Amino acid sequence: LIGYNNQFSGRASQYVAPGTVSSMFSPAAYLTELYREARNLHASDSVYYLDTRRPDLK
Amino acid sequence: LKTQQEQTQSQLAFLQRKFSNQALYNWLRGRLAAIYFQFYDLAVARCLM
Amino acid sequence: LKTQQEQTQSQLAFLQRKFSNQALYNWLRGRLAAIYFQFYDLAVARCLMAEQAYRWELNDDSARFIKPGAWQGTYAGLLAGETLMLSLAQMEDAHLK
Amino acid sequence: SIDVTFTAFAEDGRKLGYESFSIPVTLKVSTDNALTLHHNENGAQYMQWQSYRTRLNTLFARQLVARATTGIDTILSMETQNIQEPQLGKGFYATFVIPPYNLSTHGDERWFKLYIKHVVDNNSHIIYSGQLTDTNINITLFIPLDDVPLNQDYHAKVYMTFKKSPSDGTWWGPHFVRDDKGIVTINPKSILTHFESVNVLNNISSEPMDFSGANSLYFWELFYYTPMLVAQRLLHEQNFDEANRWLKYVWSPSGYIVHGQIQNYQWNVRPLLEDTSWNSDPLDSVDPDAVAQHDPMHYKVSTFMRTLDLLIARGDHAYRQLERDTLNEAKMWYMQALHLLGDKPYLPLSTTWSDPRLDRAADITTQTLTDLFLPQINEVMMNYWQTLAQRVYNLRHNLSIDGQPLYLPIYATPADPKALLSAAVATSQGGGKLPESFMSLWRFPHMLENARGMVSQLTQFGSTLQNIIERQDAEALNALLQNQAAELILTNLSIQDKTIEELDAE
Amino acid sequence: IYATPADPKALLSAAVATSQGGGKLPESFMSLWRFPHMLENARGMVSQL
Amino acid sequence: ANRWLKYVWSPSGYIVHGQIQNYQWNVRPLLEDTSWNSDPLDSVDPDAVAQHDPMHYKVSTFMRTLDLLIARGDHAYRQLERDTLNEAKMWYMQAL
Amino acid sequence: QYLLIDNQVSAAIKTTRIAEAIASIQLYVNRALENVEENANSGVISRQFFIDWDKYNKRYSTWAGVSQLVYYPENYIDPTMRIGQTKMMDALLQSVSQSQLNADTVEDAFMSYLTSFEQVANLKVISAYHDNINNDQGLTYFIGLSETDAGEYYWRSVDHSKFNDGKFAANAWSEWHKIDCPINPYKSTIRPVIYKSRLYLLWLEQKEITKQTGNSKDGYQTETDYRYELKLAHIRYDGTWNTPITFDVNKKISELKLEKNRAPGLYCAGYQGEDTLLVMFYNQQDTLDSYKNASMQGLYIFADMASKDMTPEQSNVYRDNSYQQFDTNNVRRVNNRYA
Amino acid sequence: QSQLNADTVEDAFMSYLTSFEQVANLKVISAYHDNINNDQGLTYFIGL
Amino acid sequence: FLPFEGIAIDQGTLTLSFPNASMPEKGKQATMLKTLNDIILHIRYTIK
């Protein structure tokens, strides 16, 4: 077909503005990723378990 | 004569194993040639400027 | 024939006693090769500095002209210089345009 | 565990009693199934670790050499990319057609995923993922089978999920069973609710060149990157017509003619012709080329952009001539770029956000949205409309490329015929590679010295090359001469043997 | 408070230039000299090489 | 640079043949003699003084480790992002 | 350093709740990666997210940069500036670069591209080793063999981080590299291993050593004291290989009840750290359950290339945890790291 | 002469030690002190 | 390159610092600053 709106279109349903929390590139998105990865670096019974050090972070 | 045969073969081994062998020159030519040509296009462009 | 044995040994002796013997070339190589490599790293670093200047003047930080393959261990660095000379010519052209 | 006893004694030896603790120690060793290597009867080699089978080799490298031998068009044809490879292992091919996007089904979101079950486990694995379009999606997947089925009604199950009712119920999606003699059928108890159609491709034991296999990297360089590179370089040299021709090896907006027959496709790279749906799951990488390739749609888009860049460059080239006739040419080229972009898409922005707790936000995938965060617009692509809009505006308002006013005459001053001739002559004198010489800021004596230094550097490379050549030839000769000495020696050895036989005869 | 996102095109040039040739390209320190000065110094350094 | 310093000194110890060792210093003459001397070599050569009394190398080794941690710190510091400043901080805290 | 927040800063510094969270965590991770915190979970550390920590994921600025690069690669990708350009492409470009760029120039370059390709297009893959704990993370290293010359060993690696919807993203695979070591394995018992973060490979060879006289007085010997040399070699940083170190494993092999024509199964895996290589020999069975309670003869190899017999007290543990990596008749399996 | 890494230094150590071995155990034949007190100055040695 | 050359005209912050400004501590700029009417920057920038 002819046009960007006919080919390639229809990818990311809704979009967000570049400064919102909801953006996948926002600091919140970064926080979410760091958290899901860091969350399990230490054993749940360890003094350095992330939730032991910071019970509020979650 | 057998000795001469062996001596001839050791000379080939030398020619093939020495650093400055045909592989070296084949490589140097191929690489330099690419450079020379590319350099040329640039040299021309400045001459044209 | 005995005299030809003597003559051959005399020629071998010469090869082992003349100043420009193999020891000389192995020595000259060991030192020049050490210099050439070190000099190369310095040459690259400056080419890279020229490149930073290129980038700071033309506000474009994606530019890279200096290619990491200039020094091949195989073939002992031969043509590393010529390789860099081209990259600089290219950088210079990019600037002029 | 470690058994720790706390005990003590009195000064007079009396025990003061005790307390005992036990510190557990757990040895945790993760285990999983090993990756398995296989070599099949048909010569295919592959790696398997789940239900996934990855091809390790290719068996037609010779055909490719034979095709390159007859020219660029033979090697880069579509036919080349249809050289087939054997199937990897017990299994079959089936075509799945996913219907057009609707809201009565597939509401709100456009993603869907296809999963396979009961093949190596009773669990599921994703075999395809993508997004629903205004039309259907027609794909073919290889469905692997194990030696012994985990289900006696069917040997494999395939089902679709898509946010709305992603139920994985019994009989939702086709159930496949292997009959004897290699025949695969769909168990009639199953329901194709989420498929437009399913077709078991009986008698197909092969597939076209695998751009996802271990040697696929070479096909990507051969069929996609090389022609894009060549066009890139030609464009830098301002050879706009050749860059155009070269882009056509990847994409022809007007289609192709093959063997006279008018063909029905525009993308000439098989994996770009295929994959007409965005992958709904992005590749979790840091390498943009691994992302592309994994999802070929990205190359389709970069190809699209390069085509526009070329149209734009041709327009810009004309614009800068500042002759009213060339300004009209520029307009024409920009109008084509606009035709090609089509309408600027409307991209509404959402204000919906649930303010979730970080722990809840940490929504992962392994083996009111389905994710939490949303993408941005992609200003680089949007800028193509903005760019053309501005360039066209300037033409409509009689402005220069940077918006400056200009007062060109209605009719152009005639070109100086002497200069037209020298240009024509130089072009036809030889070479022809006499590109725009850009008139820059530097005055003649500066540029003369610069050109001069550039040339003396060239004369040095020249003499250097001359020495290499003379040496390359000198060495070729020394080797020849030794091989020749060796041959004469062998002949002399035969002569000496006969000489000895003669003495024995004496 | 939050850093300006790095420009992805630059990250790519570096990544390509990190794995290509092993990435043996040392830090190019920001200097006081302008391009034509440094260009000439580099050129002299290369011709010596 | 770190890996190489570990051939001489590795605070936290070494694993040898899978076993946990109780030494911190991997150079026999630095591991031995933890007593700074009392009657120093009379010389003009600092290299002869060290060696003679190995404690001086133990200290210069210690300094190099600190110099390394600092350099990592400074590197991050100079990137001037809030994130890299916090990184610099941890490197300095480790040196402390 | 415990609460992951600096309580000695002046009031002058401002932040946001999110910005501090993205700091307390960044410190948490850095202390774990630098082993300040001595017992982190290695099955987590080994994940790609952390592998990229020092280039992209430790800073918002680079994280955000990459995320944009990967989300919309079409705005950044380039046929020249790309990752995964092969040696064959370099050769293509070099000959293309020697003359004017046109179709004929590239036709000849494509031909040499393809003839270089053909040579490794169908190497037999012999074995492979996964360098992670987690099968979907890290890389698998493969060793193959020319389909032409009896020798010629080559290797590949595949990055599993580029594996997603059942398939690898093409440049996930490295090109074949040639091993210049004159390897002559017995029954192809060759395994790659990542050891000391280097590519090592080890294999068995039989040394046919015997007497020239059948009874040491008048006669001849028939077969041989087929001694088993376990050889270990590694790649140098310049791509060449060094001379292998030979270890004596004859007592382990004579103990395994192998037939005349059966090489012992060879298990090799790096211990997750400590530069210790775990090698076990076994009599290959038809099924994996047959290794339950099956005796094995192993050894430890250390960075200091000394070795120790692996007492059955320990080989029994490694077996319970490492079987299902063991080859069985008619299949081959990839070993992974032991942790 | 090349990139600094572990392999470069291993090769270097091998030649280092080779040269060392050649003089590692010479027989000392005799020696001479160059001062009049044995706590100062130098002692010169001849080996073989 | 000149001081501050290459900085975007719309990004970041400038600071001008006068040491020894505090009057209670008898600084040197302290008496002069009471007579400083303004601060003027002269910014030479280019558009490309």
Side-chain angles (χ1 to χ4, degrees), chain A, chain B, chain C, chain D, chain E, chain F, chain G residues 1-223 225-339, chain H, chain I:
Chain A
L1 302 176
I2 299 169
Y4 190 79
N5 63 308
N6 296 319
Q7 295 187 35
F8 315 125
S9 69
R11 183 180 178 179
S13 68
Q14 296 182 331
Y15 297 85
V16 298
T20 63
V21 67
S22 66
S23 171
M24 70 180 281
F25 305 108
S26 71
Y30 180 51
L31 178 58
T32 300
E33 186 175 358
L34 289 170
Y35 182 80
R36 68 182 65 186
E37 294 292 310
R39 180 181 67 196
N40 297 119
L41 286 167
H42 283 290
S44 65
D45 58 346
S46 175
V47 70
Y48 305 126
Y49 179 62
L50 185 61
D51 295 317
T52 300
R53 286 178 162 171
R54 292 292 298 274
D56 60 308
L57 179 60
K58 68 180 183 280
Chain B
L1 292 172
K2 291 290 290 190
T3 300
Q4 291 175 343
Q5 184 177 10
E6 291 178 355
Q7 291 177 341
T8 300
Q9 293 300 311
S10 73
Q11 290 181 25
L12 288 169
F14 177 80
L15 293 175
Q16 295 169 337
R17 295 174 183 174
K18 65 176 176 169
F19 183 82
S20 58
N21 63 17
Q22 291 178 38
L24 177 62
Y25 292 109
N26 290 337
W27 179 85
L28 291 169
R29 183 172 176 180
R31 185 173 178 87
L32 183 60
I35 292 168
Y36 179 68
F37 178 80
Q38 290 294 310
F39 199 82
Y40 168 78
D41 280 346
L42 294 169
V44 173
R46 288 185 180 81
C47 292
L48 293 174
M49 291 176 74
Chain C
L1 294 173
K2 290 290 289 188
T3 193
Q4 292 174 59
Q5 187 177 2
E6 292 170 349
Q7 291 171 39
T8 298
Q9 292 296 306
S10 295
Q11 291 178 28
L12 288 167
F14 179 80
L15 295 177
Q16 296 171 41
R17 296 291 179 271
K18 69 189 179 75
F19 181 89
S20 59
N21 64 16
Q22 291 178 40
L24 178 63
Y25 291 105
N26 287 285
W27 179 85
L28 290 169
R29 182 171 174 179
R31 290 178 68 87
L32 183 59
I35 292 168
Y36 180 66
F37 179 78
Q38 291 175 60
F39 199 83
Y40 168 80
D41 283 347
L42 293 170
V44 173
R46 292 180 193 172
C47 292
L48 292 173
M49 292 173 74
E51 195 181 64
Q52 183 62 50
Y54 177 86
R55 287 191 288 270
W56 198 242
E57 292 183 357
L58 303 178
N59 188 8
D60 182 353
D61 60 334
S62 71
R64 299 291 184 279
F65 299 94
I66 305 304
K67 304 298 183 182
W71 182 279
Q72 295 294 305
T74 301
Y75 315 115
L78 292 168
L79 299 177
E82 290 78 2
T83 300
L84 291 172
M85 186 62 81
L86 178 60
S87 294
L88 292 172
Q90 292 171 342
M91 189 183 297
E92 182 187 0
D93 188 67
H95 189 275
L96 289 170
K97 293 186 173 71
Chain D
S1 66
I2 306 299
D3 182 348
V4 180
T5 299
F6 288 79
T7 185
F9 298 84
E11 291 171 358
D12 60 358
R14 290 179 293 108
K15 197 183 285 184
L16 301 172
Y18 71 95
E19 187 173 50
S20 300
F21 292 83
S22 178
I23 301 169
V25 179
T26 299
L27 175 59
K28 183 183 289 181
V29 180
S30 297
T31 63
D32 204 340
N33 294 297
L35 306 180
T36 303
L37 304 177
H38 297 274
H39 185 201
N40 205 331
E41 293 180 356
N42 65 10
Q45 296 181 71
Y46 65 98
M47 180 174 71
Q48 180 174 8
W49 62 280
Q50 293 185 351
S51 64
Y52 306 126
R53 301 182 191 276
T54 298
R55 189 184 299 278
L56 297 173
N57 58 338
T58 182
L59 302 176
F60 59 91
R62 178 60 60 89
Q63 293 183 40
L64 294 170
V65 172
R67 288 183 68 81
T69 300
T70 63
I72 193 168
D73 297 306
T74 298
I75 193 66
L76 299 180
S77 73
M78 186 59 76
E79 288 77 1
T80 299
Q81 298 174 69
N82 291 318
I83 295 167
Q84 295 185 331
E85 298 169 5
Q87 71 181 75
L88 275 63
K90 185 182 179 183
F92 64 95
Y93 296 87
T95 299
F96 295 84
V97 181
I98 296 97
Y101 183 72
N102 200 319
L103 300 176
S104 70
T105 182
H106 311 295
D108 294 347
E109 298 175 2
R110 290 178 178 272
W111 64 272
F112 69 96
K113 297 185 180 187
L114 300 179
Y115 292 84
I116 191 163
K117 293 176 82 177
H118 297 285
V119 178
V120 298
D121 202 339
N122 292 320
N123 286 310
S124 65
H125 299 278
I126 298 167
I127 63 171
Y128 180 83
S129 64
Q131 298 185 312
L132 299 169
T133 71
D134 58 330
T135 189
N136 63 17
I137 300 168
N138 187 335
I139 61 173
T140 299
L141 302 171
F142 180 71
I143 298 173
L145 298 169
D146 204 354
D147 287 346
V148 178
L150 299 176
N151 186 297
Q152 303 303 303
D153 288 282
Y154 58 88
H155 300 170
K157 176 175 188 293
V158 176
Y159 69 96
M160 188 183 291
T161 61
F162 53 91
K163 174 67 181 291
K164 182 169 172 64
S165 298
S167 66
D168 192 26
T170 306
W171 300 305
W172 285 82
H175 292 190
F176 300 87
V177 61
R178 189 77 166 189
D179 204 326
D180 195 356
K181 306 299 189 290
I183 298 167
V184 177
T185 66
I186 297 170
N187 184 309
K189 292 178 179 178
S190 68
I191 305 164
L192 303 183
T193 302
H194 299 147
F195 297 87
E196 193 175 80
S197 66
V198 180
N199 185 15
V200 176
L201 304 178
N202 282 291
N203 307 319
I204 305 303
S205 63
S206 62
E207 63 187 39
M209 182 169 82
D210 185 6
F211 281 87
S212 69
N215 291 324
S216 70
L217 183 58
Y218 293 106
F219 299 141
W220 282 103
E221 291 183 341
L222 179 58
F223 298 105
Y224 178 78
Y225 291 114
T226 300
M228 291 300 286
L229 180 58
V230 172
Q232 182 178 59
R233 291 180 179 184
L234 293 168
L235 178 57
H236 290 169
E237 294 176 358
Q238 308 297 294
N239 187 342
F240 297 116
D241 289 345
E242 289 292 304
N244 182 251
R245 186 177 67 80
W246 280 99
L247 291 173
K248 290 176 177 172
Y249 281 112
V250 175
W251 184 37
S252 177
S254 61
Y256 300 91
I257 305 299
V258 178
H259 296 176
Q261 184 179 59
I262 296 165
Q263 300 302 323
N264 61 336
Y265 67 92
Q266 297 178 21
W267 292 97
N268 203 48
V269 178
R270 190 180 71 78
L272 303 183
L273 181 57
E274 299 181 9
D275 294 323
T276 59
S277 176
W278 288 102
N279 292 339
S280 63
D281 288 326
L283 180 66
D284 189 8
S285 184
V286 298
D287 179 2
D289 287 281
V291 175
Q293 297 174 11
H294 187 72
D295 186 341
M297 190 68 87
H298 290 297
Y299 286 125
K300 291 175 79 175
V301 175
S302 73
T303 301
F304 183 82
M305 290 177 173
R306 297 291 86 77
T307 300
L308 291 168
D309 289 344
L310 180 59
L311 291 170
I312 293 167
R314 292 170 76 95
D316 196 64
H317 184 78
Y319 197 102
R320 292 176 187 276
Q321 300 302 309
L322 303 179
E323 178 178 350
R324 289 185 188 278
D325 288 349
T326 62
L327 292 174
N328 287 336
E329 182 178 5
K331 193 180 288 186
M332 179 276 293
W333 286 114
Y334 294 132
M335 294 309 290
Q336 292 182 359
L338 290 169
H339 181 75
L340 185 59
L341 287 168
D343 288 291
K344 189 173 188 181
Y346 174 67
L347 303 173
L349 303 178
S350 176
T351 62
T352 298
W353 182 252
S354 64
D355 298 321
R357 290 182 176 187
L358 179 60
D359 201 65
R360 173 62 183 81
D363 187 6
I364 64 169
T365 299
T366 189
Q367 297 186 88
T368 60
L369 300 175
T370 59
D371 200 330
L372 177 60
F373 297 89
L374 294 97
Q376 295 183 33
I377 294 296
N378 197 15
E379 288 76 1
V380 171
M381 181 65 220
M382 295 308 292
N383 287 339
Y384 280 108
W385 281 273
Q386 193 63 53
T387 296
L388 289 167
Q390 186 62 57
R391 290 172 187 269
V392 173
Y393 179 89
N394 286 340
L395 290 167
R396 287 173 176 167
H397 293 278
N398 203 36
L399 305 173
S400 178
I401 195 68
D402 57 337
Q404 296 296 303
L406 73 171
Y407 304 98
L408 298 176
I410 300 304
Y411 299 95
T413 301
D416 182 336
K418 184 70 176 291
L420 291 175
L421 181 59
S422 72
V425 172
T427 300
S428 295
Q429 182 172 44
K433 188 177 186 183
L434 298 168
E436 181 177 359
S437 175
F438 187 73
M439 179 181 147
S440 189
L441 295 174
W442 291 104
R443 295 178 190 173
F444 177 76
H446 180 76
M447 289 307 298
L448 178 62
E449 185 64 19
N450 290 344
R452 181 174 293 167
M454 188 66 188
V455 174
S456 71
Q457 183 62 55
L458 182 61
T459 58
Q460 291 176 344
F461 288 122
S463 72
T464 300
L465 186 61
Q466 182 67 31
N467 289 340
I468 292 167
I469 291 166
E470 292 183 14
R471 292 288 291 106
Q472 184 179 36
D473 286 340
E475 291 298 309
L477 181 58
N478 287 344
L480 177 61
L481 294 174
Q482 290 297 312
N483 287 333
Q484 290 180 349
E487 185 173 59
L488 293 174
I489 293 166
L490 292 172
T491 301
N492 289 339
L493 289 169
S494 294
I495 292 167
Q496 187 65 49
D497 286 346
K498 297 301 284 178
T499 298
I500 292 167
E501 290 175 355
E502 179 176 339
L503 293 177
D504 290 344
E506 288 290 309
Chain E
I1 300 303
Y2 300 95
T4 301
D7 185 335
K9 73 184 185 296
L11 291 174
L12 179 58
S13 292
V16 173
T18 299
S19 64
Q20 183 178 55
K24 295 187 183 294
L25 302 172
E27 181 181 5
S28 302
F29 188 73
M30 183 65 209
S31 182
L32 298 174
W33 291 100
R34 293 179 187 272
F35 176 75
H37 179 75
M38 289 305 297
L39 177 62
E40 291 303 316
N41 289 343
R43 189 176 300 110
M45 188 66 178
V46 175
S47 71
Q48 182 64 58
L49 181 62
Chain F
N2 185 252
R3 193 185 74 81
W4 278 98
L5 290 174
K6 289 177 175 171
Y7 280 112
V8 175
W9 185 40
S10 181
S12 80
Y14 297 88
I15 305 301
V16 178
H17 300 170
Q19 303 294 301
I20 299 165
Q21 303 300 302
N22 63 333
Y23 65 88
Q24 303 294 300
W25 294 90
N26 202 48
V27 178
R28 186 181 71 79
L30 302 183
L31 181 57
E32 297 184 7
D33 291 320
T34 60
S35 172
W36 179 76
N37 205 325
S38 63
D39 188 4
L41 181 66
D42 184 352
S43 186
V44 300
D45 180 4
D47 294 294
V49 173
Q51 299 179 0
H52 181 75
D53 182 351
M55 285 293 288
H56 292 296
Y57 286 125
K58 291 174 76 166
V59 175
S60 69
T61 301
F62 181 78
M63 289 176 176
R64 298 293 85 77
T65 299
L66 292 169
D67 289 343
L68 179 60
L69 292 171
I70 293 166
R72 289 181 181 191
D74 294 350
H75 182 78
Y77 199 104
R78 291 176 184 276
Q79 293 177 359
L80 302 177
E81 301 179 5
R82 290 291 303 274
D83 295 350
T84 67
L85 290 173
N86 287 337
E87 182 179 3
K89 194 178 285 181
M90 76 177 277
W91 288 113
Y92 296 130
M93 294 307 290
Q94 290 181 358
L96 289 169
Chain G
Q1 294 295 302
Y2 183 70
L3 295 177
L4 306 171
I5 188 165
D6 187 349
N7 61 337
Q8 295 174 65
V9 299
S10 68
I13 297 169
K14 305 296 188 286
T15 191
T16 64
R17 290 183 187 277
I18 291 169
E20 291 297 302
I22 304 168
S24 68
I25 296 168
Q26 290 174 332
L27 179 59
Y28 182 82
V29 173
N30 284 329
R31 288 173 59 89
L33 294 173
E34 296 297 330
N35 300 315
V36 176
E37 300 180 6
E38 291 180 356
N39 298 294
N41 183 338
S42 65
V44 177
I45 294 292
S46 70
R47 292 170 62 83
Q48 185 62 26
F49 181 80
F50 294 106
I51 292 169
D52 286 315
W53 185 253
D54 291 316
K55 294 181 178 176
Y56 307 114
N57 295 331
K58 70 198 280 183
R59 285 150 65 195
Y60 176 74
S61 65
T62 56
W63 173 86
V66 172
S67 292
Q68 292 177 31
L69 178 59
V70 298
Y71 193 74
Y72 297 116
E74 55 268 18
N75 294 318
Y76 310 109
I77 59 173
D78 188 78
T80 301
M81 298 299 290
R82 63 181 173 89
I83 300 167
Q85 182 170 300
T86 65
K87 290 178 184 177
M88 293 178 194
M89 190 67 187
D90 288 346
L92 185 153
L93 292 170
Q94 182 176 307
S95 71
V96 171
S97 295
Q98 292 170 336
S99 192
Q100 295 300 329
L101 176 63
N102 60 68
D104 296 348
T105 299
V106 299
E107 285 177 342
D108 291 305
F110 282 120
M111 291 175 71
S112 72
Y113 180 81
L114 292 171
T115 58
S116 292
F117 170 70
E118 182 173 3
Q119 297 300 304
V120 297
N122 197 33
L123 300 181
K124 183 176 179 180
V125 177
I126 296 169
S127 68
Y129 176 77
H130 198 289
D131 63 352
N132 212 290
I133 296 168
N134 299 310
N135 284 339
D136 61 331
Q137 302 293 304
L139 297 100
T140 297
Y141 293 84
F142 299 84
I143 298 172
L145 173 65
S146 174
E147 71 276 16
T148 58
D149 195 279
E152 299 277 304
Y153 291 87
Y154 298 85
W155 64 275
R156 300 285 283 266
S157 64
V158 64
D159 185 342
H160 288 288
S161 71
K162 293 178 175 182
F163 184 76
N164 180 59
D165 56 338
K167 62 197 185 300
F168 289 94
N171 72 340
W173 288 87
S174 67
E175 63 181 290
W176 287 104
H177 292 260
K178 188 174 187 177
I179 299 170
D180 60 334
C181 179
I183 296 169
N184 295 278
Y186 174 69
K187 306 290 180 173
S188 298
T189 60
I190 300 168
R191 301 284 175 178
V193 66
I194 303 303
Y195 177 75
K196 299 171 76 180
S197 298
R198 298 285 288 269
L199 178 63
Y200 276 82
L201 79 166
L202 66 164
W203 67 96
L204 297 174
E205 294 184 0
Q206 291 177 331
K207 183 177 181 177
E208 292 183 312
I209 183 166
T210 191
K211 305 298 185 183
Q212 303 303 302
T213 300
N215 61 10
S216 301
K217 294 182 180 179
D218 187 355
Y220 65 95
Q221 293 288 323
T222 59
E223 295 180 2
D225 186 10
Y226 286 99
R227 293 182 186 172
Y228 292 87
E229 291 184 351
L230 178 65
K231 294 183 179 182
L232 179 66
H234 65 92
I235 198 165
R236 294 187 179 85
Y237 291 108
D238 67 351
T240 66
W241 292 76
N242 61 12
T243 301
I245 296 169
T246 301
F247 300 87
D248 185 344
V249 294
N250 288 289
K251 66 181 176 177
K252 291 180 162 73
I253 294 169
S254 292
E255 179 63 18
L256 294 173
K257 304 303 182 185
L258 303 172
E259 301 87 351
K260 184 181 175 79
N261 62 336
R262 183 183 296 270
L266 175 61
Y267 178 80
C268 301
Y271 185 78
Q272 69 182 325
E274 306 174 37
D275 294 329
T276 299
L277 175 64
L278 306 175
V279 179
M280 302 185 285
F281 295 88
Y282 59 96
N283 185 14
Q284 180 175 293
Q285 301 296 302
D286 296 292
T287 67
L288 290 172
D289 56 296
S290 294
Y291 295 116
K292 291 179 177 176
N293 304 323
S295 176
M296 301 183 83
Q297 299 296 304
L299 68 158
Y300 295 88
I301 299 171
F302 306 106
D304 179 334
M305 292 289 172
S307 63
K308 293 179 188 291
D309 282 340
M310 184 182 289
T311 178
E313 290 177 351
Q314 295 177 335
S315 73
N316 287 329
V317 175
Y318 292 124
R319 184 181 68 248
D320 287 347
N321 292 327
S322 297
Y323 81 91
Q324 306 186 58
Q325 297 183 22
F326 293 175
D327 290 344
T328 60
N329 294 330
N330 305 320
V331 298
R332 289 170 292 160
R333 294 183 176 89
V334 176
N335 297 312
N336 59 19
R337 290 185 185 272
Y338 183 78
Chain H
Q1 292 173 336
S2 192
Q3 299 295 319
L4 176 62
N5 60 70
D7 298 344
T8 298
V9 297
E10 287 172 342
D11 287 346
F13 283 120
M14 290 173 69
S15 69
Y16 177 79
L17 293 171
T18 298
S19 293
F20 171 70
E21 181 176 0
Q22 292 177 341
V23 297
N25 191 18
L26 302 179
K27 182 175 178 178
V28 177
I29 296 169
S30 70
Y32 176 78
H33 191 285
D34 64 356
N35 206 325
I36 67 170
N37 299 321
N38 288 282
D39 62 329
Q40 293 179 68
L42 293 100
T43 298
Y44 296 85
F45 298 84
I46 301 297
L48 175 64
Chain I
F1 287 106
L2 300 174
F4 305 115
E5 180 169 0
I7 295 169
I9 61 168
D10 60 349
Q11 297 180 351
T13 302
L14 296 174
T15 298
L16 180 65
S17 178
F18 296 87
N20 300 312
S22 178
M23 186 65 82
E25 300 187 45
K26 299 181 183 178
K28 293 174 178 171
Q29 303 298 297
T31 61
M32 178 277 295
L33 290 169
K34 290 178 68 62
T35 60
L36 177 62
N37 293 335
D38 208 336
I39 299 168
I40 307 298
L41 305 175
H42 303 259
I43 300 172
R44 290 184 176 201
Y45 71 96
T46 65
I47 300 171
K48 185 178 289 196

